Amino acid sequence: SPFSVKVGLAQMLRGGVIMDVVNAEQARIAEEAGACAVMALERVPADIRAQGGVARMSDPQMIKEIKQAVTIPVMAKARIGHFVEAQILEAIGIDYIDESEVLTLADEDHHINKHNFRIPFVCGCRNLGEALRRIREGAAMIRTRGEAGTGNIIEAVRHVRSVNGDIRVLRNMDDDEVFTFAKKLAAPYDLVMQTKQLGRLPVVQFAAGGVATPADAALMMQLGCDGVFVGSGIFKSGDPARRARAIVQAVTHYSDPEMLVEVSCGLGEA
Amino acid sequence: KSPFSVKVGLAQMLRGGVIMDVVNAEQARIAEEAGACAVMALERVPADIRAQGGVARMSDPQMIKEIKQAVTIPVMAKARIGHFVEAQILEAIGIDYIDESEVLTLADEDHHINKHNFRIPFVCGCRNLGEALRRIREGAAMIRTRGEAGTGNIIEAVRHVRSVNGDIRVLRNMDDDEVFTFAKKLAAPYDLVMQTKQLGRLPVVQFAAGGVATPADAALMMQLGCDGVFVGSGIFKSGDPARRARAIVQAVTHYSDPEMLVEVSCGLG
Amino acid sequence: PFSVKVGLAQMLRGGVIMDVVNAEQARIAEEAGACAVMALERVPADIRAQGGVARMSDPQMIKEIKQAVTIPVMAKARIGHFVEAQILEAIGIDYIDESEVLTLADEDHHINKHNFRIPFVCGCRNLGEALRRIREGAAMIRTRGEAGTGNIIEAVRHVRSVNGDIRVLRNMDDDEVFTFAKKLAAPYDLVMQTKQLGRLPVVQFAAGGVATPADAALMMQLGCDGVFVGSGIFKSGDPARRARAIVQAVTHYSDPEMLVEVSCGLG
Amino acid sequence: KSPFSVKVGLAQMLRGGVIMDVVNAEQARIAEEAGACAVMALERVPADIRAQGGVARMSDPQMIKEIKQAVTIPVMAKARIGHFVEAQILEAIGIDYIDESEVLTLADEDHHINKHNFRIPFVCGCRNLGEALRRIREGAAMIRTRGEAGTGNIIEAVRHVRSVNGDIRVLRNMDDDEVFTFAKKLAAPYDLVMQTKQLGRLPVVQFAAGGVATPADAALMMQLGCDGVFVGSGIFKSGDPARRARAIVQAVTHYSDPEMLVEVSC
Amino acid sequence: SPFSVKVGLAQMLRGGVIMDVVNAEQARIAEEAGACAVMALERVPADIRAQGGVARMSDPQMIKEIKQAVTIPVMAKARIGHFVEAQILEAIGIDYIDESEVLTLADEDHHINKHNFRIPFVCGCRNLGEALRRIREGAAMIRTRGEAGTGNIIEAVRHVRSVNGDIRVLRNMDDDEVFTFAKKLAAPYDLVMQTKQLGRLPVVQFAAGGVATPADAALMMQLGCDGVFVGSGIFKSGDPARRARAIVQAVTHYSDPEMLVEVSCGLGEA
């Protein structure tokens, strides 16, 4: 009912690219390049790993600057388990909250109870069980955690293959054996049977962590992802507008090699 | 007959050849002039990949096309292991051969590209016979021994060449009844193992790669049963690249002629 | 040709094969509607117990059973004992069982079954094991189960393992089947054949611990094409009746009313 | 013709043969009559050695002489491994072959008899090629695969035969440059390894021993590349020993003829 | 036959000192000081350990410069297992090839098949079995590997004592027990019996690795060595001619303490 409408809200981002932006200049460039949403944060994931320090929810002032600078949906990060950082973001009037593992963990044992919010949440996962548990907690959209800040697609591929692999195993599986499968996944049985009946994840599945090139973006789409997230890697190059446009084109035309060649050609240093 | 057999055939044309890593057109011309049978186009060398660290991907199509238009010999380029889209892009640029390379950052830890789904032929690495047979069944048209790229040290290449050729020779004479268990222990497809037994060699062209630094190295690989060698930027990181290039070509052509090896090695710095 | 031997074995689909130690027992098994009999001198329950080495049976006793019935006759060769197989081929039996219930004769190699004109049965515990036996030329696979115990638990584990992995395979990304063949240690061409068919490229029966009609029927409902049954049948009061019951159970495996009638008063 | 080559030659005459364990003259006559190419004289069988326990030595020369005078086919007897004096005694009784046997109680854990110091030829056991080559260099004229005596179980004999013949085949095709390291890993004398490469087989007669109980067993050994088989008192622990004996001889003679194997096995 | 003549060639160096030389200046000094042979290489063993990098066969140009600069035999190094580096050296017309462990190993499992060459090889060893295996592969001369580049005689003494120790054990050994001794050494039985009958190594045995002083050289000779190798240690001093002459004199007069005092006196820093 109110969950299905949050699920529905996130289906509108299918075939899209979401871009990390630290200011309004960057948010405009991302919108202009055809990003389906922007992710507002103050310190990038590559400079969070490197500089160290504690990474929290961004200053509401800077989030509001980005929300008023574009007409596409705006997302922002709450530390895992930080249900009050989420309450604040809901109250600023952003479109989506990302319960992010790129920020400093705030509860080691419990995630936000996402059903208690009106606006939809994105959660990370590395396997099907992790995704189903986030969904039952009320996540409306799943991303594969991948390995943020590296530019290395290897973990994203492992995770996407893990999730889609286990979904395919489910489809043909003897019904009598799905009980034990739900135990081994540590996932709620009703959401596992829903996943069997759909033959896919009961919500939008995007790829995140290490998508650096058009070819990366397209690979994720060909593996069965519904869209991709991309870091500030884009804006740490010579012509950010061009690199941004390239990844959008790549996700739109993911099965067209001729298109991938044209956008990749002369694209510089990643 | 089959589209695979045609790709295997295409790769036989490189037998007795030297393939050279080139980062620009200047280098590609030198390699062609020195008698290289093909060039391998990449932006960052394997010795500077190990050193600088960072993620190593497929090269910019712009620079690959510059090298393709600068020579008439075949051009190869690297796709990260399992990165089937980097391969699609390279197929579409119109290069001759794709190298599914372990010199680049791994992109799938568990799966290699399904190489049968491509029109142009692939090179794959291996360290033993089972690894080579698995790459072939995935559709590799040409195998190289992974060796140990960026070091200048032939020791790993020798281990691997000896491992592969060693196991091929064991196979040739092996009781047929025992080849089933041999296929299990190799974790290799039984039909390609029996094909290898019947031929008494690898069902595709086998080159050596990783640590071939000197003419003597190149010739050693050929005397161990390799069909050709790959060579890194080591060539172009010396005083007279033209000369060092020419020397390794001559060494692979005249691998059983000590008198020739002395002449090309003499004053090589 | 292999496909001819595969085809020969499809004729046993929906059948019960019965261990028999003499002609009296072979006639009872045929009369009860067994689709084949398995000739041996010492049963698997008395092999575990008496100890000692268990070999191919005396050709004299096998020939007595072959001349006593018109249904196919099977006999056991020790694993890897290709000469015990040559002898059985030459006696004119229909099927050779390369059996793990006999004393192993080669720890590292199975018979090269392609070098024989008559078809072979082989055991397995998982898909990889079955595919390897098939490529060696097995025309029919049984799940090894746990012979001599009367305990169905291992047969269920193995049937579920094989059918489970076949189902996983059907829906599996083609690009991932290479690595799947590596992890199974199975020949890639037979794995892709199994994917295309959506089942085992030969007849799959259950063996080891099938003691009751309910056991037989459970095997059939799990996706087996038939069952083997030991001398357990003939170690009871009315062997004819217990034999008939298991045949009926395999024929009518989805009919609870039938299973009640044959199980009732079975002692 | 070296004195070793003559002993090697003597043993080649047993090619295609069956050697039978016999505890008396009655049994020795039956074995000769059934077409055994030699008899092996001992007091306690290997199946009753494992069971009764105790120390197993060279047999009483009296009983060996009774068997030697009872047949015209060669007679063999067992010396404990390393017991060079038990060998001296057997040489002096005038038997044809000495078996340096692991079925008897070991007498030297670290050294085998120096078999070159004897006029008559020796049989030695092995489990792999290196072990065989080392026995040969010590002067063994004939090798048997140790198998697993007293059990009736062919499994160890098959493992060992496959091991030896397997390594011989690996050798045939092997790069010459790599044979040095192969000799190191086998712990075998390099000259005998190169001899084995050049012949494509064992430089002496190779028989199978330990667990050959049935005609099918005997024939399997022959099809795996053995030149003959040894057989225990298993034969004489049956109803008609003459018939079971004759069957194994027929099986080794006609090892690639299934129709023959069926008739003798029935 | 052709092996015995290579063995014979190397017997001519008995009582000699072989000197590592990196140029013709050094080769002349070594010849003048009475060296029985020179060993031609580009990078010394002390600077190979320190600078790191891969150490290969030297440039044939520099080897030929040294061969034409002296009338005493010239040796050069081939990496272990590098049979083509050996073919090249044979073809330059040097007198001896050293299959050296001071260079980067090129085959971990196999040494050069030295019988396939016309000119004689030197090989290293640390024990008798290792020496016998090199000899059977066709080595005409053995050196004890010692510990090259250190100036420390300790490993050379360990190895010389190990080899000569096992040769002495062999001499008195029951013939019946030599079979098992050959197994434990992992050495070819025929070469072990040859060693028993001679009461020494069937080829010339020199000491190498850590011979820095006249006293070192003499100690090696008194332990039963037939000669010594010496590194560039000699040429890394004030008067190379003098230090060179001293070690030659020491090996010639190894049982004359009065001679050892005179050559050692005022010899400076090693």
Curated annotation (Swiss-Prot), chain B:
GO terms for molecular function: protein heterodimerization activity; protein homodimerization activity; pyridoxal 5'-phosphate synthase (glutamine hydrolysing) activity. The active site is at K78. The keyword Zinc does not apply. Pathway: Cofactor biosynthesis; pyridoxal 5'-phosphate biosynthesis. CDD domains: pdxS. It catalyses: aldehydo-D-ribose 5-phosphate + D-glyceraldehyde 3-phosphate + L-glutamine = pyridoxal 5'-phosphate + L-glutamate + phosphate + 3 H2O + H(+). InterPro entries: Aldolase_TIM, PdxS/SNZ, PdxS/SNZ_N, RibuloseP-bd_barrel. GO terms for cellular component: cytosol; endomembrane system; plasma membrane. GO terms for biological process: amino acid metabolic process; chlorophyll metabolic process; hyperosmotic salinity response; pyridoxal phosphate biosynthetic process; response to lipid hydroperoxide; response to non-ionic osmotic stress; response to oxidative stress; response to salt stress. Catalyzes the formation of pyridoxal 5'-phosphate from ribose 5-phosphate (RBP), glyceraldehyde 3-phosphate (G3P) and ammonia. The ammonia is provided by PDX2. Can also use ribulose 5-phosphate and dihydroxyacetone phosphate as substrates, resulting from enzyme-catalyzed isomerization of RBP and G3P, respectively. Also plays an indirect role in resistance to singlet oxygen-generating photosensitizers. NCBIfam families: PRK04180.1, pyridoxal 5'-phosphate synthase lyase subunit PdxS. Belongs to the PdxS/SNZ family. Vitamin B6 is an essential quencher of singlet oxygen in plants, that can protect cellular membranes from lipid peroxidation. This is Pyridoxal 5'-phosphate synthase subunit PDX1.3.
